[PDB]
């Protein structure tokens, strides 16, 4: 897989139906089973977007990437203290470059 892989970066993505990662690093994931991941987090000081490759047989942020087979990165909210946290994974080229905050489409 080819994925955006900037780790955790500041983001201005907020209150939008979709956002671009604005990550300038597209990497070949080390292992063929890895998929793309995006994690959007907002606290009272800032917003970040994390982009990585990850093996979906392993948990990430204490969750299983149950959506790894999806070609698109559909953000879904997770329960975490002191912040708003959304995550998605996907398995098409650079798919974590475009994060979608809804299932409506």
Curated annotation (Swiss-Prot):
Known disease link: Hereditary non-polyposis colorectal cancer 6: An autosomal dominant disease associated with marked increase in cancer susceptibility. It is characterized by a familial predisposition to early-onset colorectal carcinoma (CRC) and extra-colonic tumors of the gastrointestinal, urological and female reproductive tracts. HNPCC is reported to be the most common form of inherited colorectal cancer in the Western world. Clinically, HNPCC is often divided into two subgroups. Esophageal cancer: A malignancy of the esophagus. The most common types are esophageal squamous cell carcinoma and adenocarcinoma. Cancer of the esophagus remains a devastating disease because it is usually not detected until it has progressed to an advanced incurable stage.
Taxonomy, superkingdom: Eukaryota
Effect of residue 13 to R: In a gastric adenocarcinoma sample; somatic mutation
Bridged cysteine pairs (disulfide): 3-36, 6-23, 13-19, 29-53, 73-88, 90-95
Organism annotation: Homo sapiens
Purpose: Transmembrane serine/threonine kinase forming with the TGF-beta type I serine/threonine kinase receptor, TGFBR1, the non-promiscuous receptor for the TGF-beta cytokines TGFB1, TGFB2 and TGFB3. Transduces the TGFB1, TGFB2 and TGFB3 signal from the cell surface to the cytoplasm and thus regulates a plethora of physiological and pathological processes including cell cycle arrest in epithelial and hematopoietic cells, control of mesenchymal cell proliferation and differentiation, wound healing, extracellular matrix production, immunosuppression and carcinogenesis.
Protein's cellular compartments: Cell membrane; Membrane raft
Effect of residue 25 to V: In a colorectal cancer sample; somatic mutation
Name of the protein in question: TGF-beta receptor type-2
Family named by the database record: Belongs to the protein kinase superfamily. TKL Ser/Thr protein kinase family. TGFB receptor subfamily.
Assembly, per entry: Homodimer. Heterohexamer; TGFB1, TGFB2 and TGFB3 homodimeric ligands assemble a functional receptor composed of two TGFBR1 and TGFBR2 heterodimers to form a ligand-receptor heterohexamer. The respective affinity of TGFRB1 and TGFRB2 for the ligands may modulate the kinetics of assembly of the receptor and may explain the different biological activities of TGFB1, TGFB2 and TGFB3. Component of a complex composed of TSC22D1 (via N-terminus), TGFBR1 and TGFBR2; the interaction between TSC22D1 and TGFBR1 is inhibited by SMAD7 and promoted by TGFB1. Interacts with DAXX. Interacts with DYNLT4.
Post-translational modification: Phosphorylated on a Ser/Thr residue in the cytoplasmic domain.
Glycosylated residues (UniProt): 22, 46
Extracellular-side segments: 1-105
């Amino acid at each position: 897989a080819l994925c955006k892989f900037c780790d955790v970066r500041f983001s201005t993505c907020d209150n939008q139906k979709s956002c671009m990662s604005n990550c300038s690093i597209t990497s070949i994931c080390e292992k063929p089973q890895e998929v793309c991941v995006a994690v959007w987090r907002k606290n009272d000081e800032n917003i970040t977007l994390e982009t990585v490759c990850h093996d979906p047989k392993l948990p990430y942020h204490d969750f299983i990437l149950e959506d790894a087979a999806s070609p698109t990165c559909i953000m879904k909210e997770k329960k975490k203290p002191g912040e708003t946290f959304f995550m998605c994974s996907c398995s098409s080229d650079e798919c974590n470059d475009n994060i979608i905050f809804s299932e409506e489409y």
